[PDB]
Every structure is written in structure tokens, then in C-alpha cells.
């Protein structure tokens, strides 16, 4: 039995990553997410200069998962790409980058100066993306940036949206691997006791994330790795357990990213992760993640 | 303490009733719910002629909730249109009956017939309803459809769509309730033990409700809350206690309808949530609806 995953001229010991924005903003959490059991791992989104993001509270774990409107706080592109550049080892794990250009703009000038670390360093771009401004964002970047990436995405609700963000996607061939999906946006989490949301900004409106989303995530996945048989899919959203876990690469996923259940146990989780996900092949009579992904049985 | 609600011209013994679809399709089960301790009831959602659905199974309860493609099986618009004319008993409570035409002009047809009966025996319609199809739909109801009405809104999950749906919405004084939400539209549902999606429609992604819907229905209830005050907001999802409904009340919410908790339970859960709900307010000390209704507390 092997969770050996092999993708972008990478090798991966396991599909494990954390999810962006999850314990990946400081030096120590990156050195950390490189130290844990994770296959890989993926810095902070970020922006062209630091940024200290949204009032606190502005994350609340709960029952069913999470809420939060962070507001991008990140250490500002020179600290990831530095962290890229000169710090990470390689030797360990491969490293995604994240980024979360506030324009179109500020990501073609933040992949511009990525290129070259991308090449001398091997660092792989995950882009986090309205479909008519989405073409022209890619394109853009296809234009700077000589090298294969990947596009976080929202989800979507319906066979219309998978069809049109699929098509545009197809476009571009760079585009490598789909991350499906952020957070389930704008939920409002009301404490009944307090009679008063749980988070500060934008009057308690947040992204969810956890078992709320992990329909949404499989569908997304399902959807994309059907209409994107030229890519990989990522998975994230609502893994907790090497079962969750084995439903995501059921539904398609190559690396399955973990977001909510990471910031709630710590680093430590991939270890748990990675032997459940090996039990559950083992009670399931699989040796690999290829002899089960995408095979999700229709009726 | 008292649940009574005042809306519409009429008087509810308190803000329950069934959400559209559930129990709420054949004779008996508009009898039932007629007969149970909820405040009002809505038919179907109908189609011009009867239809049988979806190939089954098509819908599944789950531990966070539900999944379905029922793919609107009714018995049709004259059956709803005679139950509400010839055989509802309007001393027991309101009637709302739902419509769902298949385009634009089957929702034309059926409210020039049902004009007749709302003004004689006082059914109230409830309009399921791209933004630009929403806008067509509703111009051609407010023309051809004399009285008030309101409409069943799929959720959005940004403020971009909130500030779009009301903008819309608010064009049309006939529209004086807004229902939110329908399902959370086309989750996958996949059982690690049968490696299979659980429904038999659309390789198996259909609507979710239940626990996994409610912060997103009080993102709803309480964004068309703020931004239609002109109009009442009746809540749908992820209610299966009185501290749920008291949590929609308080997002702003004037009814509150329950789908995949009275699928589990029948209509005997009327009883349980006037009761649960009456011991929520005991314990907080209100004595009215009105004391808390939209009065969530930010930070
Ligand atoms: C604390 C917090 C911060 C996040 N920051 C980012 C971000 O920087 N960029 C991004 O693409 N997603 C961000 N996310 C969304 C996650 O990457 C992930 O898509 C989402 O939480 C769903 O996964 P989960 O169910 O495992 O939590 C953040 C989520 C949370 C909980
Ligand atoms: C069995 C099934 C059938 C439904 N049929 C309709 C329908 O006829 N019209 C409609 O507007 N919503 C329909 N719905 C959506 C529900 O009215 C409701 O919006 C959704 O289930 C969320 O509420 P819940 O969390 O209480 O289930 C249906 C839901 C289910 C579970």
C-alpha cells in the first residue's frame, strides 16, 4: 500500500496538504507544516504588500466546522517568495505558493517576479480566482507566467456554472489543477444564548468551512474532474478523517487539502490523516489512489 | 407568551408551517398538516399538469440533513387550485399554495386561474423563482397577477447577489414576502461504504437541506431582512428545533418552515417546536415574537 501521489514533476508521499490561509501565514507555521506528515503544504494567499486583515474575532470554530472573514491578513509576497526562494526544503516536501491579488494587476506583477523562483526552485503557483473577468485574469497571467499552475475556486451550485468555469478553464492549458473548493461564503453563525452573531466583520457574515461544505466540496470535485479531464482536481473542504479523505479522491481529488480540522488539532493531524486514510484502503482491499479515483459509483 | 403572527390580512397561531414539498402533495397530507399544530401549510409546488418526478430513490436523509432530485412530482395545478377552492378549511389556518412552472408562460397561465380563488377564498401564492429570468418571471406574474404574492429564493452567497436579488425584488410591490431559502443546489452525497452516490438523478448531485444549510439560511433570512424592508422574510432551512426557530426569528424571519425535519418526523413535529420554541423564550424571558424578531446583535 502506497499514498504516493505523482503530479507537476513532483513526487508526494501522501495527498495531505493544509488548506491556504491555514496555519501557513509565519516562518514557524510554515517550518512546522514542512516538519509534519503532510505530502506537501501551501503558504498564505497573498498580496503584494503585507496586510494586517479584518477586526478580531474574526474566526469561530464550531460543531459543524468554522466561520471566518480573515480579510487576507499575509505577510506581503517578498516574505513568501523569500520563504520559497531561500528557505524551504525541498528536500522534504514540495511547496505551493498562494496568491491573492486584490487586482489583475497585482497578480501579473507578483508572477512576474515568481517566474524565476519558480524555475530555480521548483515553488508551484496556486492562483485563487464572474467568468468574463475570470478569462481575462488568465489570461493575463498566461501571458507572464512560463510555467504550469493551479486556480483555487469557489463553489459552485448548479450543472450551468460547473459548465461555464470548466469551459473557460479548458482554455488554459497551463492550468494544471482546479482546487475545489473555499468556503461556502457569506453564512451567518447566531449564537442563540448571546442572541448576537460570532464574528466581527461585515455584521457576522463569513465563509464556512468543515462538515457544513463537504457535499458542496465532493460535487465540486465530482464536477470538475469530469468536465477538466485534462487536469487534476484538489480536494478541500470538510476532511476530518482518512474517510472523509477517501471520498474526496473517490470524487476525483489528487491531493486532498485540509483547512477547519487542521486549525482546530494542529499539524499533528497528518498523522492521523495519513494512517486512517491507509486503514480505510486496507479494511477496502486498496493498495493505491489511483485504483479508486474518480470511480464514485452513479446509480 | 403568545406565537401569534399578524401578516398578510390574516392571523397564524404561530410562525410554523411545512416548506414547500414536504408533506404536502396528496390529498391526505394536505389534510394532515391542515389537522397538525402548525400555523399554516403550502401546497406542492405545481406544475400545469401532473408529473411523476424523478426515477428514485431521490431523496435521502442523512446524519447533517437531507439530499433530493425530486424533480417535481405534483398532482398538478387544478388539483392544488381545487383543494384550495372546494376543501381547505380556512377557519383552521391560512393557505399557501406554491407554484413552479416550467417557464414563464405556465406561470402566467396558472395565476390568471388562481386570481379568482385568492380573491374569493384567500390562498396565498408562493412563487418558486439569473437574474435577468427572475426579473422576466416576476414583471409577467406582477402583470397578469392581481394581488399580493411572494417569492421562494434559491440562497446566494455574496453581498454583490444580495444587493442584486433585493434591488430586483423591490421593483415589485406585489412581492411582500421573500421565502429563504430553497436546498443548498446540487451537493454530492457519496457513501464510503458502497463507493456510490445515494440518489438515482443527475449521477447523483441534488439539493441539500437540514443542518447543513442553516447558517446560510440566516445569511439569507437576515441580508433580505436588511435590504427589503418594505417586504416580510420567511424562513426556510436547518430547522429541527424551537431554539432553530429561534434563531431565524432573530435573524428576521415572520414564518418558519421546516423541510427535512417534518420529512423525518410527520406532522407530530408541530407540536414539539410550539412547545420547544414557547420554552426558549420562557427561559429568555419573551413573551412575543415581535420583542426579538431581526434584533440579532453584532459586534
Ligand atoms: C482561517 C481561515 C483562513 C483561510 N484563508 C484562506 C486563504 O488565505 N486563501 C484561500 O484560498 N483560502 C483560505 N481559506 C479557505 C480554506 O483554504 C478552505 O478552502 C476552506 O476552509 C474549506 O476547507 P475546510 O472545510 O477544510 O475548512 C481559509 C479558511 C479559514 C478557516
Ligand atoms: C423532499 C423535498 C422536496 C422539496 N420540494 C420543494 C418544492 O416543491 N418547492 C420548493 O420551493 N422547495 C422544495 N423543497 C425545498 C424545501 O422547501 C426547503 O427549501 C429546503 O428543504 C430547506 O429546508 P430544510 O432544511 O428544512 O429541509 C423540497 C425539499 C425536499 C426535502
Known amino acids: 500500500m502506497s499514498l504516493q501521489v505523482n503530479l507537476l514533476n513532483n513526487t508526494f ?21 514542512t516538519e509534519s506528515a503532510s505530502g506537501s503544504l501551501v503558504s498564505k494567499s497573498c498580496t503584494p504588500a503585507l496586510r494586517e486583515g479584518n477586526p478580531t474575532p474574526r474566526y469561530q470554530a464550531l460543531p459543524l466546522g468554522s466561520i471566518n472573514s480573515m480579510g487576507l ?4 509576497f517578498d516574505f513568501y517568495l523569500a520563504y520559497a526562494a531561500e528557505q524551504h526544503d525541498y528536500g522534504k516536501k514540495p511547496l505551493f505558493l498562494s496568491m491573492s491579488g486584490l487586482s489583475m494587476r497585482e497578480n501579473v506583477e507578483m508572477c512576474k517576479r515568481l517566474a524565476a523562483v519558480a524555475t530555480e526552485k521548483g515553488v508551484i503557483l496556486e492562483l485563487n480566482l464572474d467568468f468574463d473577468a475570470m478569462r481575462q485574469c488568465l489570461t493575463a497571467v498566461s501571458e507572464v507566467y512560463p510555467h504550469s499552475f493551479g486556480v483555487k475556486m469557489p463553489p459552485y451550485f448548479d450543472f450551468a456554472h460547473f459548465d461555464a468555469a470548466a469551459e473557460i478553464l479548458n482554455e488554459f ?5 482546479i482546487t475545489c473548493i473555499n468556503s461556502i461564503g457569506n453564512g451567518l453563525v447566531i449564537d442563540a444564548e448571546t ?6 466583520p461585515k455584521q457576522g457574515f463569513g465563509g464556512l468551512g468543515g462538515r457544513y461544505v463537504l457535499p458542496t466540496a465532493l460535487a465540486n470535485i465530482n464536477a470538475f474532474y469530469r468536465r477538466c479531464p485534462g487536469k487534476l482536481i484538489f480536494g478541500c473542504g470538510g476532511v476530518y478523517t482518512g474517510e472523509d479523505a477517501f471520498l474526496h479522491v473517490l470524487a476525483g481529488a489528487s491531493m486532498v487539502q485540509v483547512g477547519t480540522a487542521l486549525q482546530e488539532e494542529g499539524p499533528s493531524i497528518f498523522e492521523r490523516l495519513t494512517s486512517e486514510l491507509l486503514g480505510v ?3 477496502k482491499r486498496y493498495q493505491t489512489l489511483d485504483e479508486f479515483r474518480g470511480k464514485v459509483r452513479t446509480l
Open 173 to 177: 492549458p497551463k492550468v494544471q489543477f
Open 73 to 76: 491578513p499575509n505577510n506581503g
Open 13 to 33: 508521499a501522501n495527498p495531505f496538504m493544509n488548506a491556504a490561509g491555514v496555519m501557513c501565514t509565519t516562518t514557524e507555521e510554515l517550518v512546522a507544516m
Open 195 to 200: 442572541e448576537s452573531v460570532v464574528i466581527k
Open 281 to 283: 484502503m486496507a479494511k
